């Protein structure tokens with residue numbers, strides 16, 4: 001039996017959003033206009049490039065709050081607005097306009113990881129599963145009712161980069177399914193449970209410094225979560241050394257956090273609060289990322305056992 005076609009305004013900025021606009025362009029839905037952030041140092045956003053390529057009208061208001069930028073929305077005559085990593089706020093007046101409202105594709109399984117960095121934070125906290133949630137947008141920050149969710153396992157080697165890639169494929173599927181339910185009137189909205197809510201904070205160069213008072217397993221999560229950016233690091237001999245890969249080894253003899261337990265071709269083993277961090281792939285400033293073997297060959301003195309970082 002026949003599905004239905006909606007007129008849609010799409011609002012998004014980054015690659016994650018462009019992959020959603022791509023699925024929409026391939027669907028039977030009608031994309032009447034695309035909102036995206038103003039060009040920044042000047043570069044057009046991936047969404048803009050994709051929209052222009054397909055000849056869709058692009059709109060780049062600095063703000064949607066001022067009352068007559070709101071006519072941009074009203075004149076497009078849309079059933080719904082789809083919002084993916086747009087980056088500007090939708091005031092109540094705009095949320096109010098589309099016949100079916102505004103929905104958002106969010107990069108976690110809500111209520112968990114509301115906010116700026118849900119993909120990175122889910123890796124960082126060692127969640128077994130993450131996912132995407134299709135949400136009916138409302139006043140608050142990622143507080144809206146949940147229309148649809150799809151799960152994704154976080155694998156042992158998943159970084160923020162590889163998980164981003166998985167969720168960019170999953171999100172468009174969830175969005176398409178949800179659009180069909182909203183067009184047919186079959187959707188079900190689930191209120192978020194506020195006690196399960198957590199916030200996902202942006203990463204910082206400050207936080208990327210390896211903290212030896214955490215457990216080995218937490219640090220290894222950090223190394224994956226902080227890849228591609230900021231990239232976990234530690235300091236030795238007044239030099240920053242980026243850490244790309246590590247492993248988590250069983251607690252041995254007691255030792256003070258930060259102590260080098262062993263250094264060899266195997267890795268560089270560092271004591272933590274709980275268990276041992278074996279650091280297997282490292283990046284000195286100005287050099288290509290290399291094995292422990294490579295770095296120890298050049299700089300053994302940095303890693304003499306019993307020394308503390």
Ligand code: MET
Pocket residue numbers: 083084085086087088104105106107114115116142
């Ligand atoms: C880009 S507007 C929505 C922001 C919100 N943190 C979300 O991605 O769900």
